[PDB]
């Protein structure tokens, strides 16, 4: 937990959403999210930001 996150990954993230979101995307998000944790935390937060709201807890 020394280095922030690859400035090339984040680009893949935002570039991933560009996809259709279902087929590759799934692998794209998980892909980067995997090759980049800090990113996942962000994205994941965004994804859950859709539920976390409806379902308060986490």
């Amino acid at each position: 937990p020394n280095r922030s996150i690859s400035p090339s990954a984040l680009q893949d993230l935002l570039r991933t959403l560009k996809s259709p979101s279902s087929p590759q995307q799934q692998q794209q998000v998980l892909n980067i999210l995997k090759s980049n944790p800090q990113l996942m935390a962000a994205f994941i937060k965004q994804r859950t930001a859709k539920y976390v709201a409806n379902q308060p807890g986490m």
Partner: protein
């Protein structure tokens, strides 16, 4: 669009993507998923998500 063109930085990076996420533009194409706007995200990916408007079809 981005909202950190006057700062830029790690947080700005994730803030850029996250920012774009909030304003899912895909909504224009995913006129169907437009419902949630990001319902295409909650789709699942793994083997579950929540339980609000089948973001995939049958979760």
């Amino acid at each position: 669009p981005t909202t950190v063109e006057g700062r830029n930085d790690e947080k700005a990076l994730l803030e850029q993507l996250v920012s774009f996420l909030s304003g899912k533009d895909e909504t224009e194409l995913a006129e169907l998923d437009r419902a949630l706007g990001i319902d295409k995200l909650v789709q699942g990916g793994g083997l579950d998500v929540l339980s609000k408007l089948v973001p995939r079809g049958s979760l």
